[PDB]
Amino acid sequence: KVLLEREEKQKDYQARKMHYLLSTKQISGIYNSPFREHPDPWELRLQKAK
């Protein structure tokens, strides 16, 4: 269960780095597109804490 907690912890330090890869500006990014969705379980994490 502490391992599962680590797995949950393995989601937040991700938000540390890919905060700078939030590719949404100019309505033209990498992960997102008018055809490939708005921040989602992968891309929702690109906006979170430091």
């Binding site: 890869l21 590719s23 033209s28 990014g29 990498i30 597109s33």
Partner: protein, 432 residues
């Protein structure tokens, strides 16, 4: 009869093609007007390889210029020989490539490609039987690399039984012109190894070093590079343009020179590279030419062949000397420098002498060989590509076009496979 269709791509490709056309016109004796002012014998019989028969003896060039920017045709047309080509072939778009391979291939590679396919199909149908297609471009930009690969793929799909030879420009970390140049190079190498017969490596920095340390020119410029590469291709093509005693063609070279299709890269080079004041003091002989074709100082490589083993070599000569000297020189070279070529395969050098000397020079000899000297370029390209792709920099531009990122993944996997193959064939041991 047996003719060669020439193709053009990229501003550097366009300028080098124009320089080559000017050089061949001058050597075969064609006035800038379009008539014939030559005074030779073989310059009329096989002259139709690159020209076409028309009324009044006015031969026309056979080369299609493909581009995305209209500013290049204006520049190349204002030259002393820009009024001799076919304006119909100057197929240029309205939007520039922006040094983007994906954007140039997708946006500027859909609605403009049809015209160039139509014109090249018309040119092929105009002749009776053909051999291959020559395309001179550069990997530095979205113009040469962006559509040259697509055109080669299309012509291979349409006409499989043709020669795909090209002289694309390899990049250099020391001398760069594009920030995303590694991306374009990685994308282009995949097509070069998947849908291309053969390819010759071209480096500007090495030619600059060659001229600076041997030619001793005051102000070397791109015109000098174009002259040198034009002379290189002229020496390459003189095997069929001017038949001699032991003539050859491109396909026999491509078969005898390429052991495996995955490795079709070569190493060009020309022998007599001297300074202006050294032209009146020189000894025209075989051993000097052999030393200048064997040494690493004269080749146009931004690398060192001595780090590996020679794989296959062709010595193409152009003059009236002998036959015994070439073979004895090769024999004593293989005997002495036994640790520079593959011992498993003897006689890795091919003899070829053109009895017809070039115009303006009496002795000329080019070097076409495939030495183990591109592996460092490949590995450094792979390393820099991985460095850029780790954090995915300059990637939004390509993603916004529509193409995904898996293409980069498969491309780098292919590069890793190719470099592994190259390195484990470099140490070609005899047995266990």
């Amino acid at each position: 009869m047996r003719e060669i269709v020439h193709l053009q791509a990229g501003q550097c490709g366009n300028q080098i093609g124009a320089k080559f056309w000017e050089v061949i016109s001058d050597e075969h004796g064609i006035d800038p007007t379009g008539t014939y002012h030559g005074d030779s014998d073989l310059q009329l019989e096989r002259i139709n390889v690159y020209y076409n028969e028309a009324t009044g003896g006015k031969y026309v060039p056979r080369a299609v210029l493909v581009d995305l920017e209209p500013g290049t045709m204006d520049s190349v047309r204002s030259g002393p020989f820009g009024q001799i080509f076919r304006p119909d072939n100057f197929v240029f778009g309205q939007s520039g490539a922006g040094n983007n391979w994906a954007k140039g291939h997708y946006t500027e590679g859909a609605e403009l490609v049809d015209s160039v396919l139509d014109v090249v199909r018309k040119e092929a149908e105009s002749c009776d039987c053909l051999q291959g297609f020559q395309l001179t471009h550069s990997l530095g930009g979205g113009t040469g690399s962006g559509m040259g690969t697509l055109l080669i793929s299309k012509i291979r799909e349409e006409y499989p039984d043709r020669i795909m030879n090209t002289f694309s420009v390899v990049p250099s970390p020391k001398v760069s012109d594009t920030v995303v140049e590694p991306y374009n190079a990685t994308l282009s190498v995949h097509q070069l190894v998947e849908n291309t017969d053969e390819t010759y490596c071209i480096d500007n920095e090495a030619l600059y070093d060659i001229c600076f340390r041997t030619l001793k020119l005051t102000t070397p410029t791109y015109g000098d590079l174009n002259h040198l590469v034009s002379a290189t291709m002229s020496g390459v093509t003189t095997c069929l343009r001017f038949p001699g005693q032991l003539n050859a063609d491109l396909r026999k070279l491509a078969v005898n020179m390429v052991p495996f299709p995955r490795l079709h890269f070569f190493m060009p080079g020309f022998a007599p590279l001297t300074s202006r004041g050294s032209q009146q003091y020189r000894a025209l002989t075989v051993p000097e030419l052999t030393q200048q074709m064997f040494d690493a100082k004269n080749m146009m490589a931004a690398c060192d062949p001595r780090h590996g083993r020679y794989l296959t070599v062709a010595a193409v000569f152009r003059g009236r000397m002998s036959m015994k000297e070439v073979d004895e020189q090769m024999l004593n070279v293989q005997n002495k420098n036994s640790s520079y070529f593959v011992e498993w395969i003897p006689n890795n050098v091919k003899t070829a002498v053109c009895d017809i000397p070039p115009r303006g020079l009496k002795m000329s000899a080019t070097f076409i060989g495939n030495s183990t000297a591109i592996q460092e370029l490949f590995k450094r390209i792979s390393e820099q590509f991985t460095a850029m792709f780790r954090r995915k920099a300059f990637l939004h531009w390509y993603t916004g076009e529509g193409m995904d990122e898996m293409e980069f993944t498969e491309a780098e996997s292919n590069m890793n496979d190719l470099v592994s193959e190259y390195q484990q064939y470099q140490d070609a041991t005899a047995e266990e």
